[PDB]
Symmetry: D2
Subunit: 333 residues, 4 copies
C-alpha cells in the first residue's frame, strides 16, 4: 500500500487513453463559447478539444468550462495552442476575428482573409486530415470552396452553413405573424446571405405541407400586407442589430450546433448551407452557394434541386455569378 487507493493503473487492460471520436472549435471566443456551451450542453462529447491563437482568454475561458465539468458529462477537454492536439477528430470549426465589417454586405473579401484562415487550417487538417470542416465567415460560399480547395476533398469535407439561419428568421416572425407554432410549419430560402437572399414562396405552408398560395392568394408587393416587406425586414433583421453583435453568435452558434449535431450523428436529413452545385441543375462554373441538402457520416450525401423560374430563379442564379465574375481577379493565394 501507499500509492493512495487500491489497485494501480493496470488491472484489466492498461495504459492508453482512447476516446473514439472527438471534436473542436477555433472560436474559443464568442461563437466559440456559444458553440462550446450548446455543444458541451446538448450531448455529443466522447472527447472534446478547444483552441486558438490565444493564450490568455484560453486559460480563463476553459476554467469556467472545465469547472462546470461536474454539471455536464464530457470527461475530457484539452486546451493548448498551435494545432497538434486536436488531431483526434472528425468535426472542426474556425471563425477568426475579422468576421463582418460591422455595417452591411457581409465581407465582400477573402483578400486579407486568405491569411487569417490559412495559417490556422492547413495545420489542423494534417493532424486529423480525416475530418470535415465547418467554415463560417460572411460569404460562406467564398470560403467553403477556398477551404475545401486548399484543404482537401470537395463535397465530402466542405460545408459552409448559412441558410438554416435565414430560414429560422424567415419562419419564426412570419409564423408568429401568421398566428401559429414553433415546430411545424414551413418554407425556404436560396442563395447566399443578404443583399439578394431569395425566398421560395412556391412552398411556404402551414402545419400541413398543404398550401398557403391557394389561399392568401399569390402576389407580393401588390397587396399591402407586404409579404415582400416581410423577407426584406428579415435581411435587415440579420443586418442592423449593430448595437449588439455576438448575440448573432448565440443563435449563429446554436444553429451551427444544430448542424454539427445533425452532421456528427448521421441523420440523413436536410440542411441548406452551401456545398456543391452539380446535382443536375447546372450552375455557371465552379458555382458555389447553398441549396437545401442532406448531411451525414463523412459530410454530405445529396443536395435538393429546384424551383419555379420567375425571375426569382434568376435572382438566385445571378448573384453567385456576378461575384465570382469579379472574384475571378480578386481570387489568388
Amino acid at each position: 500500500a501507499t500509492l493512495k487507493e487500491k489497485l494501480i493503473a493496470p488491472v484489466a487492460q492498461q495504459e492508453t487513453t482512447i476516446p473514439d471520436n472527438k471534436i473542436t472549435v477555433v472560436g474559443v471566443g464568442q461563437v466559440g463559447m456559444a458553440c462550446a456551451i450548446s455543444i458541451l450542453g446538448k450531448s455529443l462529447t466522447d472527447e472534446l478539444a478547444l483552441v486558438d491563437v490565444l493564450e490568455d482568454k484560453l486559460k480563463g475561458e476553459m476554467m469556467d468550462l472545465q469547472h462546470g465539468s461536474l454539471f455536464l458529462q464530457t470527461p475530457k477537454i484539452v486546451a493548448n495552442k498551435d494545432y497538434s492536439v486536436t488531431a483526434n477528430s472528425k468535426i472542426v470549426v474556425v471563425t477568426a476575428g475579422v468576421r463582418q465589417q460591422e455595417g452591411e454586405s457581409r465581407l465582400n473579401l477573402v483578400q486579407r482573409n486568405v491569411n487569417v484562415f490559412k495559417f490556422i487550417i492547413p495545420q489542423i487538417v494534417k493532424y486529423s486530415p480525416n475530418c470535415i470542416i465547418i467554415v463560417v465567415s460572411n460569404p460562406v460560399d467564398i470560403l467553403t470552396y477556398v477551404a475545401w480547395k486548399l484543404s482537401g476533398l470537395p463535397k465530402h469535407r466542405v460545408i459552409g452553413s448559412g441558410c438554416n439561419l435565414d430560414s429560422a428568421r424567415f419562419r419564426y416572425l412570419m409564423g408568429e405573424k401568421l398566428g401559429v407554432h414553433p415546430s411545424s410549419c414551413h418554407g425556404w430560402i436560396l442563395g447566399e446571405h443578404g443583399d439578394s437572399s431569395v425566398a421560395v414562396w412556391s412552398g411556404v405552408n402551414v402545419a400541413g405541407v398543404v398550401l398557403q398560395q391557394l389561399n392568401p392568394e399569390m402576389g407580393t408587393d401588390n397587396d399591402s400586407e407586404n409579404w415582400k416587406e416581410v423577407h426584406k425586414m428579415v435581411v435587415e433583421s440579420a443586418y442592423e442589430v449593430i448595437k449588439l453583435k455576438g448575440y448573432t453568435n448565440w443563435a449563429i452558434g446554436l444553429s451551427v450546433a444544430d448542424l454539427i449535431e445533425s452532421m456528427l450523428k448521421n441523420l440523413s436529413r436536410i440542411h441548406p448551407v452551401s456545398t456543391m452545385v452539380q446535382g443536375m441543375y447546372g450552375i455557371e462554373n465552379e458555382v458555389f452557394l447553398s441549396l437545401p441538402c442532406v448531411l451525414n457520416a463523412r459530410g454530405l450525401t445529396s443536395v435538393i434541386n429546384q424551383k419555379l423560374k420567375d425571375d426569382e430563379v434568376a435572382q438566385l442564379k445571378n448573384s453567385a455569378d456576378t461575384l465570382w465574375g469579379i472574384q475571378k481577379d480578386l481570387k489568388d493565394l
Copy 2:
C-alpha cells in the same frame, strides 16, 4: 374564408395564454446569457422571461436567443424593461454589474450595493411575490439576508449560492491529481468565499464513501505533497484568473443552472450555498453563511449540521462573526 388558414382562435377552449410555471434572469449579460444558455438548453421552460435595466443589449441579446428558437423547445420568452412582465413566476435571479472589484477579497461591501440591488428587486417581488430568489454578488451571505430581509421570508425565499462552486474546484483538480473519475468521489468545504474558505478533510473520500484518511495518513502541511497547498491554490484558482473574467460566469452560471435545476424540479437533494444557520448547531446571532443543505419545491427544507472541532471549526465559525462585527455599523439602508 380569408383570415388565412382554417379555423379561428376559439374552437375548443379559447382566448388565454397559460404557461404554468415560468422564470427569469436579471443577468441578461454574461452570467445572464451563460445562465440563459444552460437554461434554454437543458430542459426547464414551460415559460421563460428575461430582463434588465438595459434597452440595447436586450434587443440584440434576445435576437440570438429568440432566433435559436427552433433549435430548443421553449415556446415563449419575453423581453422588455422595468419589472411588470416577469411576474408570472417562481425562480428569479439578479446579478447587477458591480460584482467583484477585479482584484481579491470578494466585495467587502453592501454600501453602494444596497442601491444596485434594491431598485431592481422590490419591483420583481411584488409582481411574483410568490417566488424564491437566487442572489449572487461576492459575499453571498451578506446579501441573502439583505435580500431575504427587505425582500420577504427567511429560509423559504433566500438562497445565496457559493459552495457547490468551491466543491467543484476542490474536487476536479484533486480527483485528477488523485487519478480518478469525474462523477463519483467526494468531500466538502464550509463557510464563505475565499480568504478563509475552509474544507473538511474529515470526509474526503473516493468512489467508496470509505476513507482516504486511514490511508494517505492525516497531516496537512507536515508532509510536502501539500494537501494544504492544494486548497489554497484553489482559492487562488477562484482568484487570479483576472486575465479573463466572465468565464467565472460560464461555470458560475452553469453552477447556478445546476442549483436552479435542483431547486426548480424538487429533488430533495443537497447543496451548500448559505441559507439559515439555526438547524441546531448554534451560530452567533443572525448568523448567515453556508453549510450543505437540501433544496426543493418552495426553496429549502433542511440544512446539514456538523464537523470535527479542531481550529477548522473555529476557522469556519470566526469568519462570519468578524465581518458582521464590523458590518453591524456598515449595515443600514
Copy 3:
C-alpha cells in the same frame, strides 16, 4: 440530537408537499409501461402518478420503476388503486384491456366498452376535474366524444390520438423506399384508423415542402410502382403483426408520449388525432374524426381544414357518416 441528522423538518418553510403539475396512466400494463418508460425517460415529471384496477402487476411493475429511481430524475411516483390520489394533475390516460379483437377492423364497438371505460373515468375526472384526457381504444373518434361527453368539455378536454401514428407508418417506409432522411420530408392522412384510412397525395413532398407531384407524375394504380399498394400495405402494416402485439404498444405509447410531450409543454404545433370537426369545413352532425390540428396549454386550440375534392374527399367524408349512421342505434349508456 438523536433524530438522525441535523435539523428537523421545518427550518425555512415547512410541512407540505407541493409538486406543481403532475400526471398519470391507467395502462400500468404494456401501453402503460411503454408509456411510463418513454415518459419516465424523456423529461416531464415534476410529479407522477400511476394506477389501475390491478393490485398485483402494480406492486411488481412499480418496483422496477421505483428502483430505476436513481437513474432518472422524477422525485415522486405513487401507486395505489381506485382513483383518489392521481387527482393532483393535468394529463391522464386510459387504455383498459379489451383494445382490439386480435383480427382486423378496430373494435366496431362501444357496447361492452361503455362499461370498461366508465367505472374508471368518472372517478379520475372528479378528483382532477381540471385536466385533459387522452383516450385510446380502436375507434378513437367513437370514444373521444364518448369520454368528452360523459366526461366534461368538448374540444378542450377530449383528444383521441390516431393519425400521427399512420403518418409515421406512411412516412418511414415510403421515405426509405424513396431513398432519404428520417427527420425532414412530408405528407399526411385523414379520417380514422384502417379500412378506409385516406392519405393526401396532394402535399406529399421531400425535404423541400416543394412537390413530388410535378415529378413522379400523379396517378395511383395506373403505373405499377404502386403508390396505391404502398398505403394499403401500411394499413396492413398496422394490421397483421398479429404474431406480436404489445409492440403496437412500444410505438403506440411512444407516439402518445410524443403527443403528451407536445400537449403537456404547450408548443402550439400540429398533430392529427380527432377532436372537433367544426373549424369551418362543415361535417355531417356531431361529426368526430381527425384532421391535423394544434395542441397546447389546456388541450387544443385550432384544427387545420382542407383538401382536393376528388372522391378522396368523399372517401374521408363518408366513413365517419356510415358508422354514426348505425352507431346512432348502438349508442346509448
Copy 4:
C-alpha cells in the same frame, strides 16, 4: 430527370454506410425491450442493432421500435437472425430465457446454461471480436468468467453487473425511511446477489459523505429499529416480487442502461458489477465477484479495494469460495 428528386447517390463522397460505433441486445424480449427503450430513448445510437434466436417477436417487436423512429433520433436499427450483422460494434449484451427459476437463490447453475449462452456468444464475438460483453444471468460472477474465458480477454471484456442494483435498493428505501433525497446520500454492498449480499455500514452517510455511524450509534440487531432487518428486507425485496417479474427487468435494464451509458461514453467513474479480483486485496483463486470499480473506453480500468474486517469481511470473502469449491466439479464445458 425521372429517378425522383434532384441528384443521385454520389454528388460529394458516395456509396458507403459508415456509422462509427454501434451496439446490440440479445434480449429483444423483456430485458431486451426494457433495455432497448432506455437506450433508444436516452441518447446513444450513432448506429444500433437488435437480435435473437427468435423470428416472430422480432418482426413484431421492431415494428413498434422502428415506427417510433420519428420520435427518437437513431437513424438505423437492424433486425435479422444468427450473428452476422451486429458485428459493427463495441457493446453487446445477452440474456437468454432461462434466467432465474422463479423462486429463490439465483440460478446455482451453469450446467444447462453453458449451452444457452455459448451457441449465441462465440458467434457475436468473432464478428465484432473487438468489443466488451455485459453478461446477465443470476450469478453474474459465474458467467462473467465463463463468458470472459471462452470469450476473450479477462478484465478488458467481461463485466457482470449486479451491485449497482442492490445499492439502489439499499439506498432509496433507507433514504426514504431516513427522510431525504433521491440523488445525494450514500453507502454500499459487496459480493454477489442474495443469500449473503453483504453491505458496508462502514461508510453509509448522508448528503455530506460525513458520518451516520457517530450518530445513530453502531450496532445492528441490538437496537430494534432493525438496520439489519432493513438490508434483509431488501434481499427479500429483490426476491419475492414473484407475482410480477419482467419489471425486475424494467429496473434491471434501466440499471444496465446506466452501466452501458457509463461504459459506452467513457466517464472514468465507479460501478460495482464483478470483474477481476486482483487489485491487491488477494482473493482465493480465480476469485470472481464484485467490488466497486471504474469503467471506460474498452471496458474497465481499476477496482476499488477495501473494508473493516469484522466477520462481514469473511461474510463477503467466504461466499465466493464455497461455490467455486463445489463449482470446481460442476464446471466444465
